[PDB]
Amino acid sequence: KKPKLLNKFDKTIKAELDAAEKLRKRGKIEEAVNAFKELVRKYPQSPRARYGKAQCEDDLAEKRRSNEVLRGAIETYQEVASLPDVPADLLKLSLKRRSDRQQFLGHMRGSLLTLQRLVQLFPNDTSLKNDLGVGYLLIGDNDNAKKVYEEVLSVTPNDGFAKVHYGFILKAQNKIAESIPYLKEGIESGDPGTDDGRFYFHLGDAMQRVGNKEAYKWYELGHKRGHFASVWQRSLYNVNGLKAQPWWTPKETGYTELVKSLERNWKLIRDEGLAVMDKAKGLFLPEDENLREKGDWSQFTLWQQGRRNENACKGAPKTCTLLEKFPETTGCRRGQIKYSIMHPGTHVWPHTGPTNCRLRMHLGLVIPKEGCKIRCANETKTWEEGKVLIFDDSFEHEVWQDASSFRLIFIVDVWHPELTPQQRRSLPAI
């Protein structure tokens, strides 16, 4: 409906306020900034004049693509809420836009503060509670997020947005069966914010984990709806266009000198890893992304997000020195370089990595003769000591360990070879 943005005094200056807003809507942003700055000087308590100043700064940040200008707008949106006699609709618009722009800039804790204030000021607005839940999720506070969506559901139990987010939270807590009805019903609601790749991804995954054969129906519909490159390649942080295939040869990747270095020096890489196992085993950390059905699996990470772990590299100094010659891996801010040890009785659930922007090399270091294998998409392969396998882990893949002794590999992520130097310099780290 027609939002009511003018308090009693602002209606008496609606002519001036309209003129300034007209300048802004016509794109004359600098003229509009000056007009609203004059109105704010003249009517320092006017919320609509203050809101105009903020909206003008916001439009200006967009035109200049300037984070600095947008931080100015963020403080002016707060100023609006600081004034006397702010109409409720205007108060809510100003603080909502504040939170949205804080999130855009990455100020997740500041956005959370604004969202908490919004819910205090408007306790019957369920949408604002849903937005608060997102604020919590964005700072990693799943406990409070869960409580928010529980409150929402206890008032509006058919709220689809709250259903899919509650289901996401449940699935992340390994409450797999319980998450399925929430994710499914929320997607099916078609409510705004439910048509999101994350929810198709995790609904399918939970179904696969419980043996429900409908999982690929949801993967099909997520592909059809544009969230997945295909039903098998379900990464969600993608550069569209990159060559997509589950398995690559060294020459197909162009990183032939890296592969040669890994294979020719494999015993050195092996031996440093074994020494860490023997004398510094705490550098191997258990896998902690809920990817195991059962078994023991740990990793010893030398690089992550394109940053060298200096303490870790003390444990594998020659390996780190060897790898420094290859920026295609050491500067791959969407991958890692790590030793991975897997013991008998391990099954890694089918899963996908987050991004199509990397390829993953595996160098075999200690490979039992029998029992170890990795499937990617429909092809299944085995490791060999001193040999590299390469696969695109944005494709669904699965791992088994049923030997009688441990299996050690070395994992080296590289940028997808078709990514340009500016792409490799600019993409946000994962």
């Binding site: 855009f104 800039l105 990455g106 999720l137 991804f201 896998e287 992304e289 987050p354």
Partner: peptide, 18 residues
């Protein structure tokens, strides 16, 4: 919490505006 091998976090990147 980071997305290393999987896709389990609500978001896997940190944004910084424009």
């Amino acid at each position: 919490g980071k997305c290393k091998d999987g896709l389990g976090e609500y978001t896997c990147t940190s944004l910084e505006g424009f």
